[PDB]
Write a protein that binds this ligand. Structure first.
Ligand SMILES: NC(=O)C1=CN([C@@H]2O[C@H](COP(=O)(O)OP(=O)(O)OC[C@H]3O[C@@H](n4cnc5c(N)ncnc54)[C@H](OP(=O)(O)O)[C@@H]3O)[C@@H](O)[C@H]2O)C=CC1
Ligand SMILES: CCc1nc(N)nc(N)c1C#C[C@H](C)c1cc(OC)cc(-c2ccncc2)c1
Length: 225
């Protein structure tokens, strides 16, 4: 009943997302977009949930964690229940799946969660493909004179394109109202593939914010009791 959305920044064409436990880059403008999207909501009385793998949590500077104004959920095979508070703004879960079921219960959340964001972990992203309804992806490209950074973690681009389709024409509509961007929706060919979204440039990088949505399904069966 509450939308499950994955959000990530990836460097084309392989979609590298991290290197040696960190980000391969440092771009102020990209962190700005991520912070505003996950934080802002359409209903002022609601907050968004940010769910992340345990390793992504340890990569966030201690000064900025937990992420402010958002319900934080860290998942680890070594935690206790399916969803339990451990500190202020922090929930611990031993199961990403049961964690979602629990969050969906309107008895527990009393309909005060606008969205559920899956904000990180290559390992977490791989299990989200069936779980998520949508995907917010920042596609990054090094400019001509820029060196390509090294990377060791990647988004599963294949699974993404089997279940989801590029819905960027609806990116602006999909984001919370209060957010404003400094570009116009643009289509640019880069290394063969089509890159559609909102354009930005910082340091020696060119990047685009995009949106992915689940594909239609055939009607094979509905459970009758
Ligand atoms: N550019 C971007 O948009 C982002 C990039 N990153 C990058 O990704 C890298 C880290 O990702 P990665 O190494 O994959 O680690 P993850 O963040 O995905 O953490 C994986 C851990 O999460 C726990 N876990 C995984 N699945 C489940 C489950 N189903 N139920 C309960 N717990 C589970 C396990 O923790 P445990 O071992 O404790 O049991 C596992 O070890 C870093 O380099 C980081 O910079 C991260 C976020 C965003
Ligand atoms: C913008 C990066 C980012 N962009 C997009 N489009 N999606 C994302 N999911 C993330 C992300 C992320 C993880 C949680 C992260 C990693 C990190 O270092 C690995 C530092 C921060 C961080 C530093 C400063 N303030 C808040 C958060 C966040």
């Amino acid at each position: 009943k509450v939308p499950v959305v994955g959000i990530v920044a990836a460097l084309l064409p392989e979609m590298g997302i991290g290197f040696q436990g960190n980000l391969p880059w440092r771009l102020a403008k990209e962190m700005k977009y991520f912070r505003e999207v996950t934080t802002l909501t359409n209903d002022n009385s609601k907050q968004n949930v940010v769910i992340m793998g345990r390793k992504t949590w340890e990569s966030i500077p201690q000064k900025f964690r937990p992420l402010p104004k958002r319900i934080n959920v860290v998942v680890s095979r070594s935690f206790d229940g399916e969803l339990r508070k451990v500190e202020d703004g922090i929930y611990h879960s031993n199961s990403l799946r049961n964690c979602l079921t629990a969050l969906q219960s309107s008895l527990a959340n009393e309909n005060k969660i606008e969205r559920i964001y899956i904000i990180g972990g290559g390992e977490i992203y791989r299990q989200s493909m069936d779980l998520a309804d949508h995907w917010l992806i920042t596609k990054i490209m090094p400019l001509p004179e820029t060196t390509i950074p090294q990377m060791d973690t990647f988004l599963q681009k294949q699974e993404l394109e089997q279940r989801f389709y590029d819905n960027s024409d609806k990116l602006v509509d999909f984001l919370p109202s209060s957010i404003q961007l400094e570009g116009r929706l643009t289509s640019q060919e880069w290394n063969g593939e089509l890159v559609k979204g909102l354009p930005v440039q910082e340091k020696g990088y060119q990047f685009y914010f995009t949106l992915y949505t689940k594909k239609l399904e055939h009607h094979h069966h509905h459970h009758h009791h």
